[PDB]
Ligand binder design. Sequence first.
Ligand SMILES: Cc1cc2nc3c(=O)[nH]c(=O)nc-3n(C[C@H](O)[C@H](O)[C@H](O)COP(=O)(O)OP(=O)(O)OC[C@H]3O[C@@H](n4cnc5c(N)ncnc54)[C@H](O)[C@@H]3O)c2cc1C
Ligand SMILES: CCCCCCCCCCCCCCCCCC(=O)O
Length: 563
Amino acid sequence: SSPVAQKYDYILVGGGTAACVLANRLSADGSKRVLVLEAGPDNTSRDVKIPAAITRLFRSPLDWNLFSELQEQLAERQIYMARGRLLGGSSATNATLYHRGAAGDYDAWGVEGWSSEDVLSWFVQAETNADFGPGAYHGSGGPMRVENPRYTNKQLHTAFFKAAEEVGLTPNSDFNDWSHDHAGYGTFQVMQDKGTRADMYRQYLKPVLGRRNLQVLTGAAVTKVNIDQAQALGVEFSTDGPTGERLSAELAPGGEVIMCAGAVHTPFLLKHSGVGPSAELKEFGIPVVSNLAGVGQNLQDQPACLTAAPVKEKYDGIAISDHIYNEKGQIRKRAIASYLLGGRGGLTSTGCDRGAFVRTAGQALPDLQVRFVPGMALDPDGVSTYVRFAKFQSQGLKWPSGITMQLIACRPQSTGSVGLKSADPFAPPKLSPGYLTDKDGADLATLRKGIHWARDVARSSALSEYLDGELFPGSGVVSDDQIDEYIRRSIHSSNAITGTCKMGNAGDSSSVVDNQLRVHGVEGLRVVDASVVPKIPGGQTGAPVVMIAERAAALLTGKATIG
Ligand SMILES: Cc1cc2nc3c(=O)[nH]c(=O)nc-3n(C[C@H](O)[C@H](O)[C@H](O)COP(=O)(O)OP(=O)(O)OC[C@H]3O[C@@H](n4cnc5c(N)ncnc54)[C@H](O)[C@@H]3O)c2cc1C
Ligand SMILES: CCCCCCCCCCCCCCCCCC(=O)O
């Protein structure tokens, strides 16, 4: 009904992080008809705009509410795996931290055309930075807005920095400057515009909505790609979910389908489309267009655990929870005024924007990311704590003052999978994060050494001044066996998820796309999202996805060549 009569040069499956970038670059010259299909609604929510309202986004209608399969190795628990469900996708629901990782992360891809020297300028072109001048590592002209966080906890942020220096860490003035080592302590920059969320909807798609050769459908769930025995013809979708009519939209001669449904839903949709392992497709009676081993394999996420400590009685009131909520759980008028008049104060904060990269054991690159939060976790699951913080509003209770240190295996060795639980394309995918399954127990050792590290930092003179005991893991958790048991019971996502449609050199039977992002053995089918990342970079994965979408858009419009 909506694309009746219509042929498109490009159908983008999903309207997420990468899709918003592609929709912008691909529609620019006005020749090409571009369609964007997004399952979630328009990006209008105030909870999306205000960084601190990330607390309200978890387990909300603007999240996919995905749960993993039972993880035997994680005390037989299902892991919640947050994913944005709206225009902008996960860029609209994330912690806004701006990380590229290290030169070494891209060199390690071993994929011709995509070394550190090849990707750097695509990061720089996307960027306008408020706090770093233009040069080799920072741009001043790009659509992304990156700034230093506009909230500082004078007492606790300074205490954390002094504590890190006391335990022998060096400051890192810029975690995205590849001229110096990744390791050290400091401040993470944020994808904000004076304390407003600068998601890829706001920065790339919203400004070009008026273009006549660009059509964006929201509430548009793609059930499958249409492929012909092979060549993409287009895609099928519903605009009323499962009980809705099954509309179809068609390509123009030489017109491509571009998978931008992310590292969870891209592998899922390919499998529903006959692209994936024959074994798995055969199981639900799905015809096999291209037998690809890699589809849904090599799922990389950075797992997390945390320590948390209350402050002494004399420091009650200095935590970010005290800057946002009064003693009765009502949002402080001071916080609201500072935000709306100045783009300042606790509402500009996603909480976790100071920390460190640490080598726990002389690795080439840091294995441990620390995220310091000047607020106290009341659940050992950091994501659960954020949900509970949102539900805490107007309960007539005071959130206790304290700190949290979240410990992240940021270059993990463990891998997981996405597959099918049924043939119903509206049923949740079969999601297994595979945390702590690497054969050497390297990821478990990272997090265990991380807890030891967080305890040393808390015991430092700088932080001992402020702190009064330890809540999590607590007194009782002393031995490595007890720490390991705590980690298994409490381990949560730091919300990355890459690698499920991995790119490779010619003659790599594990890769799903070439160094030009084309699905192996299909014509007019590309993947441009986090799925293509072969080896996860150290740090949060939003910036690298935009670099890939920027490069992909240049490839497609003939502005650049790869290899
Ligand atoms: C809670 C959270 C916190 C994070 N914090 C950070 C951080 O601080 N900094 C950072 O850099 N990274 C962060 N990340 C990771 C980062 O946001 C992602 O790696 C990146 O946004 C991935 O973008 P993508 O385009 O691959 O997918 P997404 O942005 O997730 O886009 C996928 C889109 O496809 C849609 N979709 C799915 N299936 C279908 C279908 N069948 N039909 C139509 N549409 C469909 C979805 O609704 C969604 O909009 C965070 C992630 C989350 C979830
Ligand atoms: C947003 C205002 C700060 C509220 C913090 C509440 C209490 C402290 C808990 C800290 C938990 C560990 C950090 C987990 C970060 C979750 C977000 C993410 O992973 O993207």
